[PDB]
Amino acid sequence: TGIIMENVTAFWEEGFGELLEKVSFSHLCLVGNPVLKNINLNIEKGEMLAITGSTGSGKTSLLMLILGELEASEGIIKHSGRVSFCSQFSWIMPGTIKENIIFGVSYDEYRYKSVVKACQLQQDITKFAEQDNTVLGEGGVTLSGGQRARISLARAVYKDADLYLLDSPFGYLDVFTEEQVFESCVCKLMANKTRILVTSKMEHLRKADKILILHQGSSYFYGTFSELQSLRPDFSSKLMGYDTFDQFTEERRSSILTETLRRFS
């Protein structure tokens, strides 16, 4: 499916804050304040939307909007079909690595092996005596953050859906593995799946079909990467003006983005 939002505004409603947490709110609800205002986007079947912004700009909230956990108080949103969501929090259920990737869905060999390879999990499971039959306890607590995120990503990607929402999978230290995953999974394997990737890496905007930048629940820019360079030259020159920005930590990339957005409103 494709996805369209026309002039969407979404207000803080009671309970939304806890849901964001479970991944003062009552004041935000009493004062009737938007979490997202005048959002517009039009994404074709098979296209990739890259979403970035300052920290706390509404990136996750926009996903919740697509999931229907947040109501569109004004404006129009259209998409059809199953959506698959990979959250910032990487949840792990009791069971093997395989059982986690396949959770609640039926096993298919070609599909599984293909997902496992593209999410770069082979490098991980090969370190284990029982490979992907290795048993994890909930939280998969002795794994690395990147290992948990790749399992969590594989699970969401293995879901058969029309639209994939990937909230910040690529935020950890093993930064070269992340580059392979983005190339192999998001760009190749899912090349023809409609997908939305929340991200603080510039390569992802550069390879994206559409770009949405958020600041203060507002749309700072929407368009192509070419239009971002010409229509937002201050932002672009500053961020493309590092040599290896994407290999900074997620905290640094995010705070640079925040400062640059604060600067050039």
Ligand SMILES: Nc1ncnc2c1ncn2[C@@H]1O[C@H](COP(=O)(O)OP(=O)(O)NP(=O)(O)O)[C@@H](O)[C@H]1O
């Ligand atoms: N744990 C929290 N405590 C207080 N306010 C929160 C919390 N989580 C979310 N919010 C509110 O959520 C609004 C939008 O949050 P959110 O949609 O999670 O933005 P975000 O861009 O995904 N944040 P981040 O992933 O850290 O860069 C913020 O500006 C906050 O007002």
Ligand SMILES: [Mg+2]
């Ligand atoms: Mg978020």
